[PDB]
Amino acid sequence: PSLTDMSCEVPACTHSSDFGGVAIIKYAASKKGKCAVHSMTNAVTIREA
């Protein structure tokens, strides 16, 4: 899948050691399939690989 028109929204965040924040990414993608996710800022860790 190739992705475009992406927007990232953060319903709530708490700095709680336990994945205390949750984010919704709206996107348009060219085809169906599995796709990797990563965080480019060292101060934020995402649970989903």
């Binding site: 319903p11 709530a12 949750v22």
Partner: protein
């Protein structure tokens, strides 16, 4: 005979009165702290709403 009016009829702040046992009821006087401890199971998440 010379009795006068009971507290049921004369009392301030709109309160009712009864005698077995004696109570002043429903006085519209001052304000009341109320405090709730709510179990975490009761709230629905900002992503679920």
């Amino acid at each position: 005979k010379e009795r006068g009016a009971s507290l049921q009829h004369t009392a301030p702040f709109g309160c009712q009165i009864a005698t077995n046992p004696v109570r002043a009821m429903n006085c519209a006087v001052g304000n009341m702290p109320i405090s709730i401890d709510i179990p975490d199971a009761a709230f629905t998440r900002v992503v679920d709403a």
